[PDB]
Motif scaffolding. Sequence first.
Motif, short mmCIF file in Angstrom:
data_model
loop_
_atom_site.label_atom_id
_atom_site.label_comp_id
_atom_site.label_asym_id
_atom_site.label_seq_id
_atom_site.Cartn_x
_atom_site.Cartn_y
_atom_site.Cartn_z
N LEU A 106 4.69 -23.02 -47.29
CA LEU A 106 4.13 -22.04 -48.21
C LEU A 106 2.94 -21.30 -47.61
O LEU A 106 2.86 -20.08 -47.67
N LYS A 107 2.02 -22.04 -47.02
CA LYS A 107 0.83 -21.42 -46.45
C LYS A 107 1.21 -20.34 -45.44
O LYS A 107 0.66 -19.24 -45.44
N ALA A 108 2.18 -20.66 -44.59
CA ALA A 108 2.69 -19.71 -43.60
C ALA A 108 3.35 -18.52 -44.27
O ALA A 108 3.22 -17.39 -43.80
N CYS A 109 4.06 -18.76 -45.37
CA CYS A 109 4.70 -17.64 -46.08
C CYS A 109 3.65 -16.66 -46.64
O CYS A 109 3.79 -15.43 -46.50
N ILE A 110 2.63 -17.20 -47.29
CA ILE A 110 1.53 -16.39 -47.82
C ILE A 110 0.89 -15.60 -46.68
O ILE A 110 0.61 -14.41 -46.82
N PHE A 166 -7.12 -19.25 -43.98
CA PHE A 166 -7.31 -17.80 -44.02
C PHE A 166 -7.45 -17.35 -45.47
O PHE A 166 -7.23 -18.12 -46.40
N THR A 167 -7.81 -16.09 -45.66
CA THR A 167 -7.99 -15.52 -46.99
C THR A 167 -7.18 -14.24 -47.04
O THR A 167 -7.22 -13.45 -46.09
N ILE A 168 -6.43 -14.03 -48.12
CA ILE A 168 -5.61 -12.81 -48.22
C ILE A 168 -6.49 -11.56 -48.23
O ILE A 168 -7.67 -11.62 -48.61
N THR A 169 -5.93 -10.43 -47.84
CA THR A 169 -6.72 -9.20 -47.76
C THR A 169 -6.15 -8.06 -48.60
O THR A 169 -6.59 -6.92 -48.49
N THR A 170 -5.19 -8.39 -49.45
CA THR A 170 -4.55 -7.40 -50.33
C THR A 170 -5.56 -6.55 -51.11
O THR A 170 -6.46 -7.08 -51.75
N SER A 171 -5.40 -5.23 -51.07
CA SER A 171 -6.32 -4.36 -51.81
C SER A 171 -5.60 -3.31 -52.64
O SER A 171 -4.39 -3.14 -52.52
N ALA A 213 2.47 -12.42 -45.46
CA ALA A 213 2.30 -11.30 -46.38
C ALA A 213 0.83 -11.18 -46.81
O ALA A 213 0.55 -10.72 -47.92
N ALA A 214 -0.09 -11.61 -45.95
CA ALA A 214 -1.51 -11.69 -46.31
C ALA A 214 -2.12 -10.39 -46.83
O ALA A 214 -3.15 -10.42 -47.52
N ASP A 215 -1.52 -9.24 -46.51
CA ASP A 215 -2.10 -7.98 -46.96
C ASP A 215 -1.24 -7.31 -48.03
O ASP A 215 -1.55 -6.21 -48.48
N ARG A 216 -0.18 -7.98 -48.45
CA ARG A 216 0.69 -7.42 -49.48
C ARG A 216 0.81 -8.30 -50.72
O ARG A 216 1.24 -7.84 -51.77
#
Length: 712
Positions: free
Chosen positions: A429-433, A97-102, A436-439
Amino acid sequence: TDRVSVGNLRIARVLYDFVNNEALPGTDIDPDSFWAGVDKVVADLTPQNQALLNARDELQAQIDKWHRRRVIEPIDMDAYRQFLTEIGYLLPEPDDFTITTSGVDAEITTTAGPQLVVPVLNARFALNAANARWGSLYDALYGTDVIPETDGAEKGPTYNKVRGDKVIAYARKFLDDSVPLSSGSFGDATGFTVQDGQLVVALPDKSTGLANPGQFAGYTGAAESPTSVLLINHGLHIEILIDPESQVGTTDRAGVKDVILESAITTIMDFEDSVAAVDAADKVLGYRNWLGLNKGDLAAFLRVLNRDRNYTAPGGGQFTLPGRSLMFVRNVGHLMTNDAIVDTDGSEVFEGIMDALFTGLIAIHGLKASDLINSRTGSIYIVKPKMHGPAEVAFTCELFSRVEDVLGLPQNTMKIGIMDEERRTTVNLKACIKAAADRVVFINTGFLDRTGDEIHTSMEAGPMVRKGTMKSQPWILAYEDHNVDAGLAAGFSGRAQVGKGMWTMTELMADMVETKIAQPRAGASTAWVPSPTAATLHALHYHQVDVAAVQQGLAGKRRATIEQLLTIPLAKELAWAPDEIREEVDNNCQSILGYVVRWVDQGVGASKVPDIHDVALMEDRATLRISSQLLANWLRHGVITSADVRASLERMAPLVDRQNAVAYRPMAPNFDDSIAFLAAQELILSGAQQPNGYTEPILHRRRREFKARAAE
Ligand SMILES: O=C(O)C(=O)CC(=O)c1cccc(Br)c1
Ligand SMILES: [Mg+2]
Ligand SMILES: [Mg+2]
Ligand SMILES: [Mg+2]
């Protein structure tokens, strides 16, 4: 009483008044609604907070028992791994997946550079850190051992020209390496001018431009004889100050006075491991500093926050650059409670919950004009330390969401810097990220806490290698690489920081400059420094290493396996002689005592403490976590006896007393009359029973004990 009732809560009056009179006004949050929110969030989330803490204990119990029933020398890795999976310690890895934090600022998404960490309770230091966005390279070179104090180049009470010249030559080479001339060397420059929007560097027999004219960012003063020239490399600014009439300028072939480096790009204002805050009075001192920083009116003459810097563009227009480091705040983690607020049963409230509510409230001021804006993009940046696994990250997500509602902030305003500093986070770690994928705005290897957790988790397995050996063990090297792999695979490049840990040897700057370059070479877009001086020196590394290109090259790679991550740092059979064991004991006891004495008697949460070889180390709670856990482990497995520990503590104590001297109270010779001495002893002797080897329960109890005695 000295408390205010709000629903089920009884809030220390000092905290209540601070929030009402200082923090709330200007945020447009209705005070009644705020306080009702505090009660509500505390009521709703406390049960889950507690359940997560109980789950840590239960996992640790099962692991302890796994080792005790074993006896087979070499740990069977497949059996161990299967066990961890069975008990829910090692969870399945999510799909890619790819994070979506903006809404994140450029200093985090894009700029690679140093990140400074400073105790928020020290207003002077916090101010210097905020201002450390820019720093003098000449001061950093002249003032430290980066320029060796060889014969003739010693630091004296006045300017040593031989030394100064070495500083100048070091900086000229830096310029040559970072912003090369088309021909010739900055070493030979006689002057700088701006013509037709281009930088022209005068040499003795000719003039030349930059090999890459795009590295010319601007200037100050007249184009025909500027007062400074501004360059940029790898996204970081360098400014050459020109003043032939200055002390240094007069001696310089081009009249150069100094070279200023954009240094501490971001700063973490710390409420956690670098501070001692055990009650409402302490928390309020910290919150008030954080408030002054966000309002821009913190002042310690009178030291104040710097304004933005004005430049002239190459073509002649005007522009500005941030004069301050972009601020994060590090909240405490999920463990501790604090009596700054208690409920109707007299039960203390979870401190991490309070920090989220209060530091988040205060951070609103940093999103608006100072009578200037921390985050222009509208984010609040909170570092969350000491989380264990993705459920704990999810809990932090929900906590921030609920706080956002109380504060009337948009969802996902409150961003998370994730410490990867506990084993159950590392291996998930991957699961931890993802949780919080949007934060998420960073992950960072807090290697010192991580080392403490490593020891505590496998406490029952056998005796561990020496403290100094830990920094180079297989588990930690794999942990470092694994962190970078996970962040890059989650799309961190161009979106979020990939960070590494603190350089603790505050006087060994030559060594830092030589060694710490490994971090950005490993693809880290930031790493921790202890001071503004070290920020400026660490900045050098980002000019030498193209972190963006390094990250791009690492794409797709998987350089650490789960088996490597799980390689327990057990010492081999008969690894040490009596003298090496004694050294390790004294080294740990001296460091523990030096730090603890100032924590308990003076409420200083970060101190320089000379180790056994007399090297100065910035000690905080994490380093104490390691030292105490290591000795606890050695005592557990019979490497040393309780008399070894006592004698060492008793030996090192007078030395530490000697190292100090106005609010200081000697531990020797009446050791057992010293709360601080007893604290140090307790940290070791109860080390094994502290949850995950955390030092706060003992430190907080003993600091409070000290304050109570001092009050009578
Ligand atoms: O390594 C980690 O667990 C950290 O999180 C390090 C840390 O806070 C630290 C260590 C030494 C000095 C200072 Br200031 C901070
Ligand atoms: Mg037990
Ligand atoms: Mg830590
Ligand atoms: Mg380059």
